[PDB]
Write an enzyme that holds these catalytic residues in place. Structure first.
Site, PDB file in Angstrom:
ATOM      1  N   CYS A 250     -29.424 -71.074 -22.429  1.00 19.55           N
ATOM      2  CA  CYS A 250     -28.923 -71.178 -23.818  1.00 19.55           C
ATOM      3  C   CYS A 250     -28.485 -69.784 -24.305  1.00 19.55           C
ATOM      4  CB  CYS A 250     -29.964 -71.776 -24.750  1.00 19.55           C
ATOM      5  SG  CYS A 250     -30.743 -73.317 -24.140  1.00 19.55           S
ATOM      6  N   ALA A 251     -27.595 -69.163 -23.539  1.00 14.46           N
ATOM      7  CA  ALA A 251     -27.240 -67.752 -23.683  1.00 14.46           C
ATOM      8  C   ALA A 251     -26.205 -67.348 -24.732  1.00 14.46           C
ATOM      9  CB  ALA A 251     -26.751 -67.199 -22.281  1.00 14.46           C
ATOM     10  N   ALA A 252     -25.258 -68.201 -25.044  1.00 13.31           N
ATOM     11  CA  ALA A 252     -24.210 -67.871 -26.033  1.00 13.31           C
ATOM     12  C   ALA A 252     -24.775 -67.686 -27.394  1.00 13.31           C
ATOM     13  CB  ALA A 252     -23.195 -68.919 -26.081  1.00 13.31           C
ATOM     14  N   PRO A 253     -24.270 -66.715 -28.155  1.00 15.35           N
ATOM     15  CA  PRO A 253     -23.099 -65.894 -27.811  1.00 15.35           C
ATOM     16  C   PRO A 253     -23.436 -64.665 -26.955  1.00 15.35           C
ATOM     17  CG  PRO A 253     -23.823 -65.364 -30.037  1.00 15.35           C
ATOM     18  CD  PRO A 253     -24.841 -66.342 -29.455  1.00 15.35           C
ATOM     19  N   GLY A 254     -24.658 -64.513 -26.509  1.00 17.39           N
ATOM     20  CA  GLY A 254     -24.947 -63.486 -25.534  1.00 17.39           C
ATOM     21  C   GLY A 254     -25.599 -62.221 -26.015  1.00 17.39           C
ATOM     22  N   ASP A 299     -26.291 -77.809 -18.650  1.00 19.09           N
ATOM     23  CA  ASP A 299     -27.271 -78.377 -19.558  1.00 19.09           C
ATOM     24  C   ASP A 299     -28.686 -78.028 -19.056  1.00 19.09           C
ATOM     25  OD1 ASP A 299     -28.996 -80.117 -21.038  1.00 19.09           O
ATOM     26  OD2 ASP A 299     -27.445 -81.514 -21.442  1.00 19.09           O
ATOM     27  N   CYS A 371     -35.639 -69.614 -33.127  1.00 18.25           N
ATOM     28  CA  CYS A 371     -35.500 -69.001 -34.418  1.00 18.25           C
ATOM     29  C   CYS A 371     -35.940 -69.986 -35.494  1.00 18.25           C
ATOM     30  CB  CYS A 371     -34.075 -68.440 -34.629  1.00 18.25           C
ATOM     31  SG  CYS A 371     -32.834 -69.646 -34.516  1.00 18.25           S
TER      32      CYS A 371
HETATM   33  C1  LIG Z   1     -30.396 -69.978 -30.231  1.00 22.79           C
HETATM   34  S1  LIG Z   1     -28.727 -70.341 -29.601  1.00 22.79           S
HETATM   35  C2  LIG Z   1     -28.313 -68.989 -28.433  1.00 22.79           C
HETATM   36  C3  LIG Z   1     -28.399 -67.500 -28.867  1.00 22.79           C
HETATM   37  C4  LIG Z   1     -28.243 -66.565 -27.651  1.00 22.79           C
HETATM   38  N1  LIG Z   1     -29.305 -66.828 -26.697  1.00 22.79           N
HETATM   39  C5  LIG Z   1     -28.055 -65.076 -28.083  1.00 22.79           C
HETATM   40  O1  LIG Z   1     -29.321 -64.542 -27.898  1.00 22.79           O
HETATM   41  O2  LIG Z   1     -26.888 -64.919 -28.582  1.00 22.79           O
HETATM   42  C6  LIG Z   1     -28.993 -71.805 -28.576  1.00 22.79           C
HETATM   43  C7  LIG Z   1     -27.735 -72.151 -27.763  1.00 22.79           C
HETATM   44  O3  LIG Z   1     -28.106 -73.287 -27.025  1.00 22.79           O
HETATM   45  C8  LIG Z   1     -26.982 -73.966 -26.601  1.00 22.79           C
HETATM   46  N2  LIG Z   1     -27.488 -75.279 -26.207  1.00 22.79           N
HETATM   47  C9  LIG Z   1     -27.761 -76.355 -27.040  1.00 22.79           C
HETATM   48  N3  LIG Z   1     -28.196 -77.344 -26.249  1.00 22.79           N
HETATM   49  C10 LIG Z   1     -28.248 -76.971 -24.965  1.00 22.79           C
HETATM   50  C11 LIG Z   1     -28.623 -77.603 -23.753  1.00 22.79           C
HETATM   51  N4  LIG Z   1     -29.103 -78.838 -23.635  1.00 22.79           N
HETATM   52  N5  LIG Z   1     -28.523 -76.898 -22.602  1.00 22.79           N
HETATM   53  C12 LIG Z   1     -28.088 -75.601 -22.588  1.00 22.79           C
HETATM   54  N6  LIG Z   1     -27.721 -75.010 -23.753  1.00 22.79           N
HETATM   55  C13 LIG Z   1     -27.794 -75.659 -24.932  1.00 22.79           C
HETATM   56  C14 LIG Z   1     -26.129 -73.941 -27.859  1.00 22.79           C
HETATM   57  O4  LIG Z   1     -24.801 -74.203 -27.528  1.00 22.79           O
HETATM   58  C15 LIG Z   1     -26.397 -72.530 -28.413  1.00 22.79           C
HETATM   59  O5  LIG Z   1     -25.374 -71.692 -27.931  1.00 22.79           O
END
Ligand SMILES: C[S@@+](CC[C@H](N)C(=O)[O-])C[C@H]1O[C@@H](n2cnc3c(N)ncnc32)[C@H](O)[C@@H]1O
Length: 425
Positions: A250-254, A299, A371
């Site tokens: 769940c890396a975006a936006p990184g 996913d 968060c």
């Molecule tokens: C808390 S945010 C990421 C913040 C990021 N880690 C950073 O430190 O910028 C959670 C992210 O989870 C992604 N996400 C949601 N469901 C997911 C899933 N089932 N598998 C992988 N990623 C998922 C979303 O698209 C979103 O980008």
């Protein structure tokens, strides 16, 4: 162009249609002068932030609030109320621009109704105000959430909501490969700007006054990234090292993806996220900081789709979550979330934890973060997981009885945030 009609369209989308302010404001802002950009921002965020008082006031002022076909007028009028309440725009100027915005919302015949309501408020602002602040409505939180925080934080809920309602601090992360935090603050000060350290977040700088990133020294050179402090804290627990295979899930936006590489430039990082749109920002930050990583769409429930049978040395799981800890930066969260979301999000978090655990190496380390400030996504979550996962052991964050560490928002702190560190013994 009328800024008040632009804010009213921006906002109504959020509340009635569930669009995020993040998908909306960008394009709108490209269309106006710098001062117009700041004011538009102030109107959208402000109205969202106080959407409750603007509701409780409308209702005192209008026997029949504007609905159905004239609902935007509801929002325009709210944009007018916000200005009369929370700015010192000359009121004839706020009235005038708000009223004239009725032409950009294609309802020029309600100019009088808009003027009429706004003027009545100036007329009844006083009794409506007070009665409002007599109501639990003054905390600006929907009841469902206000009730969850009173249950979880019987002693602190009020400090929590007051913090959620403050203007958010701009926290920066100094890239240690080019400067020490202290060496960079010295640059900051030479550029006429003021920032402050935090003992608990060694790379962090809290700016006295938020600034555009084009004004941050070396932003485009990758000397600094805007990243909330609590989020910076994940590195303390992840403790990444060179040579390791690290999965940032769940890396975006990184934000955290790049933080790992500032800590361990030679780590092999694989960043994945289910969303191709947001995934793009990872590359951008990646490039900006002259870093490389493997970036994959996938996913976190169905990992083998993207890593077949691979195991990792450390896993950062920045889990999808209610975002209750970051309301102070995203007030639209208070209106787009629903009480039902909480158990749904806890279930998705629970599944991901179960699907990724086997991809972690024996002796490996997994840090779970959200968060959120809700127990269900955080310590409870970690509580359940250890119980059903005999090969997981808790490390330094919290206790087997209250697992992890919960940050709560505050003016010189990070956002509401949660960490749990685990090891596969
Ligand atoms: C808390 S945010 C990421 C913040 C990021 N880690 C950073 O430190 O910028 C959670 C992210 O989870 C992604 N996400 C949601 N469901 C997911 C899933 N089932 N598998 C992988 N990623 C998922 C979303 O698209 C979103 O980008």
């Amino acid at each position: 162009r009328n800024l008040r009609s632009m804010a009213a369209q921006a906002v109504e989308q959020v509340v009635e249609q569930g669009q995020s302010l993040s998908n909306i404001l960008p394009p709108l802002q490209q269309k106006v002068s710098d001062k117009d950009k700041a004011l538009l921002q102030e109107l959208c965020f402000g109205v969202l932030r106080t959407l409750s008082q603007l509701d409780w006031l409308i209702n005192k002022l209008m026997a029949r609030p504007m609905t159905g076909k004239q609902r935007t007028v509801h929002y325009l009028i709210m944009v007018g109320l916000y200005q009369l309440l929370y700015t010192r725009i000359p009121p004839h100027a706020a009235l005038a621009e708000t009223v004239e915005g009725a032409i950009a919302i294609k309802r020029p015949q309600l100019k009088g109704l808009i003027n009429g309501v706004l003027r009545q408020f100036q007329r009844q602002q006083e009794e409506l105000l007070a009665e409002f602040n007599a109501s639990d409505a003054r905390y600006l939180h929907p009841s469902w959430l206000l009730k969850r925080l009173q249950k979880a934080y019987p002693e602190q809920w009020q400090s929590i909501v007051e913090a959620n309602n403050q203007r958010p601090p701009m926290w920066l992360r100094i890239n240690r490969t080019h400067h020490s935090r202290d060496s960079w603050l010295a640059l900051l000060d030479e550029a006429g700007m003021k920032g402050f350290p935090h003992a608990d977040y060694p790379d962090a700088v809290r700016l006295e006054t938020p600034a555009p990133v084009h004004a941050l020294p070396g932003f485009e050179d990758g000397w600094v990234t805007v990243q909330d402090a609590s989020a910076q804290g994940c590195m303390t627990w992840l403790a990444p090292q060179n040579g390791e295979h690290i999965l940032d899930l769940c890396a975006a936006p990184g934000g955290k993806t790049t933080h790992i590489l500032e800590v361990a430039p030679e780590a092999q990082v694989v960043a994945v996220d289910i969303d191709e749109q947001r995934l793009s920002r990872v590359y951008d930050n990646l490039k900006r900081l002259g870093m490389k990583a493997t970036v994959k769409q996938g996913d976190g429930r169905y990992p083998s789709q993207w890593c077949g049978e691979q195991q990792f040395d450390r896993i950062l799981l920045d889990a999808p979550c209610s975002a209750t800890g970051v309301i102070r930066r995203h007030p639209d969260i208070k209106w787009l979330r629903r009480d039902r979301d909480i158990p749904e999000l806890a279930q998705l978090q629970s599944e991901i934890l179960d699907a990724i655990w086997p991809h972690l190496k024996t002796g490996g380390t997994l840090v779970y973060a959200t968060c959120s400030v809700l127990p269900e996504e955080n310590s409870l979550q970690i509580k359940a997981f250890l119980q059903r996962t005999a090969d997981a052991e808790l490390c330094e964050t919290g206790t087997p009885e209250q697992p992890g560490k919960q940050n709560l928002p505050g003016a010189e702190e990070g956002d509401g945030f949660f960490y749990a560190k685990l090891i596969k013994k």
